[PDB]
């Protein structure tokens, strides 16, 4: 049933990014023996939890999925009440609380709201973390958007000397809508994923978390940019290439002179 899995992933690849959760559950309802085989490479939105003791929010994924509970980084507690989970290193717990702090600053600077979370775990010669960012559109506004970001980062620290090897994998799951009069309703799905790795020197002024912050910042700038120009301009190009606004036989004139100049440019070769 391995070909069945390949076609299943391609089906999710071509599936409409509006009902990712429901249709993923449906596809799992086909072959439930292949269920938690798909929940590793099928990108879907996030789940907002609620830290009761702190009064914050924290997102849900597999990295915080300790057993079947979730480690709330604002409290380092598990919900459902599992007092047998895998607590992170106390060292990494302090590094994680400052990580959550720095990314709250990051999130507030670019997203001006939204929910974020940064979990962490070990490595033999380093550590690794995940960065969840979920920005839903302004509910008051008509723009029904939902920015979703997941950043798999793996700090492969070298021997000593404080130089590292920062491996990072990201993912953006966009969502957009406008109920504008000129467009009626213009829905706009979309999703990206990239990888980047750099070896920035670690120091007392340049900790690991700062290097990760620069990488996440650059990565999201590239993804948002890349999206907006390449992919969205590509869609605009497709709509313009399908139907043209200019009347034909006028386009035959401009394309006529265009082919004339094609002959002119390829005439003096």
């Amino acid at each position: 049933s391995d070909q069945q899995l390949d076609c299943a992933l391609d089906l999710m690849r071509r599936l409409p990014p509006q009902q990712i959760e429901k249709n993923l559950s449906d596809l799992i309802d086909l072959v439930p023996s292949l269920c938690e085989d798909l929940l590793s490479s099928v990108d879907q939105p996030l789940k907002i939890a609620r830290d009761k003791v702190v009064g914050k929010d924290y997102l849900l994924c597999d990295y915080n999925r300790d057993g079947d509970s979730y480690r709330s980084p604002w409290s380092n507690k598990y919900d459902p009440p599992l007092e047998d989970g895998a607590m992170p290193s106390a060292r990494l717990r302090k590094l994680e609380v400052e990580a959550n702090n720095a990314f709250d600053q990051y999130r507030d600077l670019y997203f001006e709201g939204g929910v974020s979370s940064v979990y962490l775990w070990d490595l033999d010669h380093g550590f690794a973390g995940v960065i969840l960012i979920k920005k839903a559109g302004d509910g008051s506004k008509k723009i029904k958007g939902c920015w979703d970001s997941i950043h798999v980062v793996e700090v492969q620290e070298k021997s000593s000397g404080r130089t590292a090897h920062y491996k990072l994998t990201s993912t953006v799951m966009l969502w957009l809508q406008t109920n504008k009069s000129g467009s009626g309703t213009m829905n706009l799905g979309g999703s990206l994923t990239r990888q980047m790795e750099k070896d920035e020197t670690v120091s007392d002024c340049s900790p690991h978390i700062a290097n990760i912050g620069r990488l996440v910042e650059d990565m999201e700038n590239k993804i948002r940019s890349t999206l907006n120009e390449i992919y969205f301009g590509k869609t605009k190009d497709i709509v313009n290439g399908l139907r043209s606004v200019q009347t034909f036989a006028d386009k035959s004139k401009q394309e006529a002179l265009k082919n004339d100049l094609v002959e002119a440019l390829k005439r003096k070769q």
Partner: protein, 370 residues
């Protein structure tokens, strides 16, 4: 009229013009209008109060230099009319603006209203018999003679990347960002203020422009060069003074690669070129990566193409053929291509005739020009 056509390049900082057929243009003057600051008292002083060309360059100490074209757009049509009249004055053409064909370049993706008002000016004020408008990229590839390629030119007001296929600019993949050499000059002025040598005057701003054009190079290492302590290469002011530039002669041209230094939501020139090629189809990426021409005046920095090659290696796909050509006639590639497109026999049908415009309007030009 059956006479030689006049090719005009509306440079954002340096307007280049002259009759077609000529290879190198013999009439080049900057794009600004200066008015006298001080009050004239003595009789027999200068006459005119509006200086353009070499007169403005000689009397910089009197004129309050202002620009009429910022970021490709025209913000003062009176000044552009005066500069267009100066092109036909007794120092650049010594002819009329109503008895010759006229070729006018423009930056790509410009607003419709600019072409509209330019047509209004060139057809009502000047009674131009033949007027044709074009881009500043098509002409550069025409001058280089290549067929397909990506034009990365940088004027004093814009840096646009245009992938051209067989002599035509694909409108579906033109990239344009409002950043250029003038903004680098302003950024450079800010660093000079951060060094002591502050030049807070427009008549003194061209000295900063000369500093940009003479002692500014791009650094390959964005951090090792940043942490250096250079030899502080001196520069002589136009009076006899000295400026120890130091650590700001390279940070100032870095604006063209990251516009975050000025705080503007855009992308660097290398990223602009990457997106300009990736917006196009797969069928030409291998050829466009091997066909890049660095036109434009602002692309003359010492080490611009080298750092571009390094950044494209960091952004383009796996070890693809990255060929970037550096023509020595970079400053006038667009004008040379203008002479090429103007001296064509087929050119007798692309210009919008005077009667057509006067009886139809600019909409007819938009339905006819390209």
């Amino acid at each position: 009229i059956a006479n030689q056509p006049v090719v005009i390049d509306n440079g954002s900082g340096v307007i280049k013009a002259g009759f077609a057929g000529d290879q190198i243009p013999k009439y080049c003057f900057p794009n600004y209008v200066g008015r006298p600051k001080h009050v004239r008292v003595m009789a027999g002083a200068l006459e005119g109060d509006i200086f353009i060309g070499p007169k403005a360059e000689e009397h910089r100490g009197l004129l309050s230099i202002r620009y009429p074209m910022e970021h490709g757009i025209v913000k003062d049509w009176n000044d552009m009319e005066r500069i267009w009249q100066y092109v036909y004055s007794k120092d650049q053409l010594q002819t009329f603006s109503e008895e010759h064909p006229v070729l006018l370049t423009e930056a790509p993706l410009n607003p419709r209203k600019n072409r509209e008002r330019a047509a209004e000016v060139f057809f009502e004020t000047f009674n131009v018999p033949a007027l044709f408008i074009s881009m500043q990229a098509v002409l550069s590839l025409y001058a280089t003679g290549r067929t397909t390629g990506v034009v990365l030119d940088s004027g004093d007001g814009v840096t646009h990347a245009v992938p051209i296929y067989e002599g035509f600019a694909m409108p579906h993949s033109i990239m344009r960002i409002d950043i250029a050499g003038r903004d680098v000059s302003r950024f450079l002025r800010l660093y000079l203020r951060k060094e002591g040598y502050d030049f807070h005057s427009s008549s003194e701003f061209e000295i900063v422009k000369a500093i940009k054009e003479r002692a500014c190079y791009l650094s390959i290492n964005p951090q090792k060069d940043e942490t250096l302590e250079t030899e502080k290469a001196q520069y002589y002011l136009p009076d006899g003074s000295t400026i120890e530039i130091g650590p700001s002669r390279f940070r100032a041209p870095e604006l063209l690669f990251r516009p975050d230094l000025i705080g503007e939501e855009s992308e660097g020139i290398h990223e602009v070129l990457v997106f300009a090629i990736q917006k196009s189809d797969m069928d030409l990426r291998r050829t466009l990566f091997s066909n890049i021409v660095l036109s434009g005046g602002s692309t003359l920095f010492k080490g611009f193409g080298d750092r571009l090659l390094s950044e494209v290696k960091k952004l383009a796909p796996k070890d693809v053929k990255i060929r970037i050509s550096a023509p020595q006639e970079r400053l006038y590639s667009t004008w040379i291509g203008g002479s090429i497109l103007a001296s064509l026999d087929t050119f007798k049908k692309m210009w919008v005739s005077k009667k057509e415009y006067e009886e139809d309007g600019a909409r007819s030009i938009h339905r006819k020009t390209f």
